[PDB]
Design an enzyme around this catalytic site. Structure first.
Site, PDB file in Angstrom:
ATOM      1  CD  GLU A   1      -2.928  -0.982  -0.052  1.00  0.00           C
ATOM      2  OE1 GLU A   1      -2.635   0.018  -0.860  1.00  0.00           O
ATOM      3  OE2 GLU A   1      -3.873  -1.730  -0.212  1.00  0.00           O
TER       4      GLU A   1
ATOM      5  CG  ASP B   1      -7.328   3.961  -5.604  1.00  0.00           C
ATOM      6  OD1 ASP B   1      -7.853   4.339  -6.740  1.00  0.00           O
ATOM      7  OD2 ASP B   1      -7.956   3.457  -4.691  1.00  0.00           O
TER       8      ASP B   1
ATOM      9  CG  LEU C   1     -11.861   4.266  -0.574  1.00  0.00           C
ATOM     10  CD1 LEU C   1     -11.288   5.084  -1.719  1.00  0.00           C
ATOM     11  CD2 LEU C   1     -12.848   3.255  -1.117  1.00  0.00           C
TER      12      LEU C   1
ATOM     13  CG  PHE D   1      -6.202  -3.985   3.920  1.00  0.00           C
ATOM     14  CD1 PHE D   1      -5.700  -3.120   2.957  1.00  0.00           C
ATOM     15  CD2 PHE D   1      -6.302  -3.538   5.235  1.00  0.00           C
ATOM     16  CE1 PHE D   1      -5.284  -1.835   3.299  1.00  0.00           C
ATOM     17  CE2 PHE D   1      -5.887  -2.256   5.596  1.00  0.00           C
ATOM     18  CZ  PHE D   1      -5.365  -1.410   4.622  1.00  0.00           C
TER      19      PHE D   1
ATOM     20  CB  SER E   1      -9.122 -19.565  -5.343  1.00  0.00           C
ATOM     21  OG  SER E   1      -9.830 -18.493  -5.892  1.00  0.00           O
TER      22      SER E   1
END
Ligand SMILES: [Cl-]
Ligand SMILES: [Cl-]
Length: 162
Positions: free
Chosen positions: A11, A20, A32, A104, A117
């Site tokens: 980040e 971003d 954010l 996150f 997955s």
């Protein structure tokens, strides 16, 4: 190494409001601010999050504070999500970190969609699930990060971060 260190690398750390990759107002460490195009809305959200008149600028300490809330929020959101909890509970700690990392980044929601997955990961078939995670917008938009995470996920080691 740990999740804090880990996410601090993916980040980065910015003290002045920024856009971003997706083009959203953000600040600190991946915090954010808003999906809206108004820089004011952003300031407002900033001020509201910090609890003061920031004028779009924060300090290291504040960033860190946001970061903690955010991580703690991610951990909690996982534990309260029915899709996720169990998964989480079966993994070792390294892998958990990976899980947390993705939550996150993309939210409980965007992550709950790696069902395929995830269910594979539930079975411990690393390589399989990894490849699948790759077949994703996520992976396509931010390949390098995605790669660090899927490696970690698969390996249960931190190699991808040294
Ligand atoms: Cl907040
Ligand atoms: Cl990337």
């Amino acid at each position: 190494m740990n999740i804090f260190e880990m996410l601090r690398i993916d980040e980065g750390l910015r003290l002045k409001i920024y856009k971003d990759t997706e083009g959203y107002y953000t600040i600190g460490i991946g915090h954010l601010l808003t999906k809206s195009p108004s820089l004011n809305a952003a300031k407002s959200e900033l001020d509201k999050a910090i609890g003061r008149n920031t004028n779009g600028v924060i300090t290291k300490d504040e960033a860190e504070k946001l970061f903690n809330q955010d991580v703690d929020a991610a951990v909690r959101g996982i534990l309260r999500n029915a899709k996720l909890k169990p998964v989480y509970d079966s993994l070792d700690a390294v892998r958990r970190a990976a899980l947390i990392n993705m939550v996150f980044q993309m939210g409980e929601t965007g992550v709950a969609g790696f069902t395929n997955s995830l269910r594979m990961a539930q079975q411990k078939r690393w390589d399989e699930a990894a490849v699948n995670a790759a077949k994703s917008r996520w992976y396509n938009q931010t390949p390098n990060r995605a790669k660090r995470v899927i490696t970690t996920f698969r390996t249960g080691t931190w190699d991808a971060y040294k």
